[PDB]
Amino acid sequence: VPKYLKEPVVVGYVQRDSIAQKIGIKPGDKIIKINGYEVRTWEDLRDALIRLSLDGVKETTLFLEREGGVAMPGAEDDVVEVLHLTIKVPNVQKGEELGIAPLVKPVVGGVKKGSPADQVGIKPGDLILEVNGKKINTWYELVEEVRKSQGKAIKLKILRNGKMIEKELIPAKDPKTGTYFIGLFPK
């Protein structure tokens, strides 16, 4: 069981064109309720979404907190911004997802043997910092630009035991499946 399942649901990444993106859920939001089901951990949200979809629920409420940053003068005593949303429940029977990801650091857990990854020398245990110049804070951010770049080189920045190293890769299609891939195992 992954570590994030016991952590509070703090959105680390929102998938484009997803239910969460269309409704306006943003990184930094904390999901605290959905119909009902209290949401304290990522495990609660996963179990609630499964039970809701199996019960045929197509729409329900989603309670969300939006906090963070330095308070503006005079507003430090304000109550927490709690948002009441009406959400579309994803159809888990058809594999649909809500579209949010946890804040798991993009640390590579393994590299496939022979795949153009050890080509430029990315090893297991590396930490991805920036790609294509843009800073990123989660793994799913990298997978988005891989299947959108369309083959062109993606410049990556990597930290290893203190040193910061720059690697560049270019590979693309695959015969068995048919999509752009690199060859990395998350941890």
Epitope: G24, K26, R66, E67, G68, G69, V70, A71, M72, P73, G74, A75, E76, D77, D78, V79, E81
Partner: antibody
Framework: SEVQLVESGGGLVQPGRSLKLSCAAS????????MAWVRQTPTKGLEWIAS????????YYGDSVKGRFSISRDNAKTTHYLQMDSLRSEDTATYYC??????????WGQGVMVTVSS | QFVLTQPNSVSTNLGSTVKLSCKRS????????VNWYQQHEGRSPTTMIY?????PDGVPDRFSGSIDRSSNSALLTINNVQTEDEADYFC????????FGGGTKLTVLG
Amino acid sequence: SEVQLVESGGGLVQPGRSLKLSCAASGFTFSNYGMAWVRQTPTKGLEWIASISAGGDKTYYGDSVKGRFSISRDNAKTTHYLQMDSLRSEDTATYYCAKTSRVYFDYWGQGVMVTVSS
Amino acid sequence: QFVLTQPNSVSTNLGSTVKLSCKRSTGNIGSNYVNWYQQHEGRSPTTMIYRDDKRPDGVPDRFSGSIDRSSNSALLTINNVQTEDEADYFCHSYSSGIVFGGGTKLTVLG
């Protein structure tokens, strides 16, 4: 949204005299949010004047205010106030009351005109 | 303690994409949230963007906020600029006090 902010108490005042603005709030729990006053002129634009905390215990003021204005609030009558003393002709502006949401003003009033002239 | 500098006026055409800039004089722009307000003629300001890039309910998807710590500037981007977007836009931030930008009068031609 159900938040409503309605200013009153504006108008004309001779220079050096006093004027107290009111902002009646409804549609939300008044004591749960800090209030503020922002004024506007066609020349100076938007300029923050005063800010008071949700409970009414801390006050903050802009640079153009030097002990002249006193922002208060009545959490029982869902109304906050801006007492203005020693008004100069340069204080002529449209005065908005505003509600805060931690890091910004989420809703503004309708604005009331205050003209300082003899 | 610091000021926010916006262009006095910006002219764009219908259906185009406009970038309203808000520059922080001193300090890091990421250290405090940047908020954007729209004010039509003779009307009260309404929130377009809060917390750097959050868009309230009812605001069209055409509006979007961003932060560029390289130039220490905040940018309000309006895709497919319509005629109703012709208004004043004020950026807003804070620290020990509360600071408003000078405002940009957006003119929509075409």
